[PDB]
Write an enzyme that holds these catalytic residues in place. Structure first.
Site, PDB file in Angstrom:
ATOM      1  N   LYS A  41      44.089   3.253  -2.991  1.00  0.00           N
ATOM      2  CA  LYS A  41      44.468   4.575  -3.494  1.00  0.00           C
ATOM      3  C   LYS A  41      44.367   4.666  -4.996  1.00  0.00           C
ATOM      4  O   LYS A  41      44.361   5.769  -5.536  1.00  0.00           O
ATOM      5  CB  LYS A  41      45.891   4.950  -3.092  1.00  0.00           C
ATOM      6  CG  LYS A  41      46.210   4.836  -1.627  1.00  0.00           C
ATOM      7  CD  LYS A  41      45.375   5.752  -0.776  1.00  0.00           C
ATOM      8  CE  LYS A  41      45.611   5.434   0.683  1.00  0.00           C
ATOM      9  NZ  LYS A  41      45.200   4.046   0.918  1.00  0.00           N
ATOM     10  N   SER A 265      48.365  -1.971   7.973  1.00  0.00           N
ATOM     11  CA  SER A 265      47.149  -1.264   8.356  1.00  0.00           C
ATOM     12  C   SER A 265      45.898  -2.151   8.364  1.00  0.00           C
ATOM     13  O   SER A 265      44.965  -1.880   9.101  1.00  0.00           O
ATOM     14  CB  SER A 265      46.949   0.002   7.500  1.00  0.00           C
ATOM     15  OG  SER A 265      46.487  -0.285   6.198  1.00  0.00           O
TER      16      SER A 265
END
Ligand SMILES: Cc1ncc(COP(=O)(O)O)c(C=O)c1O
Ligand SMILES: *Cc1c(COP(=O)(O)O)cnc(C)c1O
Ligand SMILES: [Ca+2]
Ligand SMILES: [Ca+2]
Ligand SMILES: [Ca+2]
Ligand SMILES: [Ca+2]
Ligand SMILES: [Ca+2]
Ligand SMILES: [Ca+2]
Ligand SMILES: [Ca+2]
Ligand SMILES: [Ca+2]
Lengths: 301, 300
Positions: A41, A265
């Site tokens: 991100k 994840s």
């Protein structure tokens, strides 16, 4: 030399899997945990901010405000520390406490919402926060084209360059769908026969079965009340899934067997990829898995 | 950046210029060893100690690796041993951050704790009992193994010289073993005879500067093995710098707030020492390199 940590964003390594049996295909993991903010991100935080700056949307005293499950907030926090901007983040209380501590270490203020109400409640709370800010910019990662565009421009080009344009399969977890969709779009433009798959939580199978549910794969899942605009489902060759406990197990398999410390994840996305490889055993495929963040921030879980 | 394993990601860490914090007319560059895959500079010494012992025939597939560590050397060893499939046992004081224990166990390590009030000497004593229970073992011994400072002499120092085009006036580094300081300073002084090189120790455990030890909170720094480690070379020190616990924490927060650099407690301590040094030598246009030993995530 770098002039700031901003110059360290991107150009992340791609590591081959050596000890785990990958069934006669090669699996490479793109370690986005290597970014200075410890997730992919950082890339979207940087592009969303830099493009808004160029567009005249951010003054020195503009308050940046964003709803996040954590990592986009961390990436923004780090960039805002370097740039001397004020950041406020709205996040669910169900995410790892390490996310809060990281954001606060960079000087970011955090507002918490009830996690059982999902990211939708974060977005609602953000509307309330806007009423008390005289001047603000909301990056809005769920709709901002600069989320998938960042990956289109950098993440995908790095994959192509490091593998010398030999990539057969790309597999990536989804929350906003930006990293999957931006990266897959560029890969597909350069490699027309590549297969690209998103992963979602088996307990929140919105794309594969049409409903959501509670799950533990932090960062993944879609809980804003629909499919995010930045997800491009036409790129998905199939929808892959992973159970909560399998994601955690694979996270530990990766660290035990490869010395790769990825997030939950990453375990989910890698488990899906290894299942895919097994189903497609002995084809000599080059399979790339995006590891979205590093595993440090999940020691409390 | 295609790698065959995380081992290939060790080293070649970035040097970042400090731009928002006032550095008093000198340039301070921070070498971010937190960028290593194990999140500290100790990845470099874990790799060299293990690779050299492999070449010597001291590590077979069934050799158990046993080491006393304050954490980061253990994490580095654990990550390398995971890739190489070696069994690792670590002894660490119970006063170090719990994240160290969890990280080492994530990589498959058996972690044994000693009472931290007794210091690293207690860890080394505990190693004796572990040795009796193993048919085959290797103890890297970062306190005595020359491959600790040699790793830095060979890689860390050369990266600093390369990145600054041989323009370095001052190098400042925290000490625990003294290896990163001593190895890096030795190479730098061989290539740059006018460079000044300073080790940093905790002000509340000022063994080198005042001859006694005490409690401190600068995890990874300080010497508590019962004397000065063999790998520390005090003839390289142009002076001994110190940092108080409170100042180290304050500087850690300043670095993250103002530069977006999330370093460990020892990075705050070493950086504060360098800032103090820079202030005392203000406006000389010096190029000062500070080693940031690890990243700050494990102190949360
Ligand atoms: C750890 C983690 N995994 C997955 C995602 C989802 O990525 P995207 O928003 O690109 O779908 C995020 C965000 C994240 O922080
Ligand atoms: C080991 C360590 C030190 C000390 O380094 P030496 O090279 O052993 O003197 C400093 N800071 C941290 C975080 C460490 O892990
Ligand atoms: Ca095309
Ligand atoms: Ca297709
Ligand atoms: Ca299950
Ligand atoms: Ca001045
Ligand atoms: Ca030999
Ligand atoms: Ca093992
Ligand atoms: Ca083990
Ligand atoms: Ca004080």
């Amino acid at each position: 030399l770098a002039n700031s940590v901003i110059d360290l964003i991107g150009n992340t390594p791609l590591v081959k899997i050596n000890n785990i049996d990958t069934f006669g295909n090669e699996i490479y993991v793109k370690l986005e945990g290597s970014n200075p903010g410890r997730s992919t991100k950082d890339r979207i935080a940087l592009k969303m901010i830099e493009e808004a700056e160029k567009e005249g949307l951010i003054d020195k005293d503009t308050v940046i405000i964003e709803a996040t499950s954590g990592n986009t907030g961390i990436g923004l926090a780090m960039i805002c520390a370097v740039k001397n901007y004020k950041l406020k983040i709205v996040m669910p209380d169900t995410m790892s406490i390490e996310r809060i501590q990281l954001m606060r270490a960079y000087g970011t203020e955090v507002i918490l919402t009830d996690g059982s109400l999902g990211m939708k409640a974060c977005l609602e709370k953000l509307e309330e926060l806007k009423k008390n800010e005289k001047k603000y910019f909301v990056p809005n990662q769920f709709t901002n084209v600069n989320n998938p565009k960042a990956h289109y421009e950098t993440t995908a080009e790095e994959i192509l360059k490091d593998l010398n344009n030999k990539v057969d399969v790309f597999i990536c977890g989804t929350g906003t769908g930006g990293s999957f969709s931006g990266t897959a779009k560029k890969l597909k433009e350069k490699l027309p026969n590549i297969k690209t798959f998103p992963v979602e939580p088996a307990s929140s199978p919105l794309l594969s079965k049409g409903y959501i549910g509670p799950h533990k794969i932090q960062g993944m899942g879609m809980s804003i009340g629909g499919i995010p605009a930045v997800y491009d489902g036409s790129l998905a060759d199939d929808i892959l899934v992973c159970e909560d406990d399998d994601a955690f197990e694979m996270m530990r398999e990766l660290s035990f067997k490869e010395g790769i410390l990825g997030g939950i994840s990453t375990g989910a996305t890698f488990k899906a990829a290894l299942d895919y490889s097994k189903e497609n055993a002995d084809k000599g495929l080059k399979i790339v898995v995006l590891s979205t963040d590093s595993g440090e921030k999940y020691l409390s879980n």
